[PDB]
């Protein structure tokens, strides 16, 4: 029976407002969708006009975009690490819009290696499992190898992104409203936005 009406509020002058009508159906509100990280659970809501809203109650997968490389991937949502609105929303690990999440980087790592030899970090270490060295070296005709060689020119990943890829988790921002559309979609944090949010997360501790 919660309501979003303006007539229960005080006036700009500050005086009380006496209601002339009781609560209307079109003025209703609904309980918040405190979308938690977990196996996909989405409840549909019949809304005004006969349309539907997708109240996502549990999500562990989101379509996040690496915008510098124009690479949108479906990824596992691992953690919630920063919320600008409420710090309770990070303790409870609630997925809302503009909340900062830790997502997986493995599909971004696959697209990373498909444009082979993005910035060299630790690639000469005591590691190299079989069956994926082909995606890095391969037997390529001279034209395709030259194409990869010229792709090497645009192999520039920010140092912070490199540390995140080493950690296996990318910082990302959820640009969707999980409690309204049923998806937790967003974009990988990079640039001054990434620096700002890293500073904020560090200063929270």
């Amino acid at each position: 029976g919660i309501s979003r009406d303006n007539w229960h509020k005080r006036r700009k002058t500050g005086g009380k407002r006496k209601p002339y009508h009781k609560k209307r159906k079109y003025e209703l509100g609904r309980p918040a969708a405190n979308t938690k990280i977990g196996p996909r659970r989405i409840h549909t809501v019949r809304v005004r006009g006969g349309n539907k809203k997708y109240r996502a109650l549990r999500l562990d997968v989101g379509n996040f975009s690496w915008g510098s490389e124009c690479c949108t991937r479906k990824t596992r949502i691992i953690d919630v690490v920063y919320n600008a609105s409420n710090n309770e929303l990070v303790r409870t690990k609630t997925l809302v819009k503009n909340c900062i999440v830790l997502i997986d980087s493995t599909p971004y790592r696959q697209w990373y290696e498909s444009h082979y030899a993005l910035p060299l970090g630790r690639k000469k270490g005591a590691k190299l499992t079989p069956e994926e060295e082909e995606i890095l070296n391969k037997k390529r005709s001279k034209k395709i190898q030259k194409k990869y060689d010229e792709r090497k020119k645009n192999a520039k990943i920010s140092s912070l992104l490199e540390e995140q890829f080493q950690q296996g988790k990318l910082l990302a921002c959820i640009a969707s409203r999980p409690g309204q559309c049923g998806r937790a979609d967003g974009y990988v944090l990079e640039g001054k936005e990434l620096e700002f949010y890293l500073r904020k997360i560090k200063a929270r501790k």
Binding site: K12, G67, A84, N98, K192, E193
Partner: protein
């Protein structure tokens, strides 16, 4: 100054700022394009809005508001809110029985963009009607004309 004075990163949603960089194209700073639009009705975009760094989603020139409906005027009387100012619209109301007028007024809370520096009490502001921006704000300052006494 530093526009990141909030708990969330402040940015213009239209502008994609972390495009892939180039070492030779780096000249000390990454460079940032500015999103601005011209509101209609012959109002010029201030040089501040085009070449500023402020983030204000309710700015008529760099925000997400449209100017439709009444174009009004008033004199600035309060500047004690964040990006909002209280202007006073004065008029004469005609009482027919006495064939006379009475001085009436009302105060409008209007959004003021950071693109308008040096706005003073008593300055005249041309404001444009937009969607509800807050509980009481429905107009956005489009133009500022200085008071004659300013020096």
């Amino acid at each position: 100054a530093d526009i990141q004075t909030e708990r969330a990163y402040q940015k213009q949603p239209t502008i994609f700022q972390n495009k892939k960089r180039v070492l030779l194209g780096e000249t000390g700073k990454e460079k940032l394009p500015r999103y601005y639009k011209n509101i209609g009705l012959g109002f010029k975009t201030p040089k501040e809005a085009i070449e500023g760094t402020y983030i204000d989603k309710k700015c008529p020139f760099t925000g997400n508001v449209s100017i439709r409906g009444r174009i009004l005027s008033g004199v600035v009387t309060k500047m004690k809110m964040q990006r909002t100012i209280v202007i006073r619209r004065d008029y004469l109301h005609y009482i027919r029985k006495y064939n006379r007028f009475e001085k009436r007024h009302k105060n409008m809370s209007v959004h003021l963009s950071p693109c308008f520096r040096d706005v003073q009490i008593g300055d005249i502001v041309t404001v444009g009607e937009c969607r509800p921006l807050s509980k009481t704000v429905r107009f956005n300052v489009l133009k500022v004309t200085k008071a004659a006494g300013t020096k």
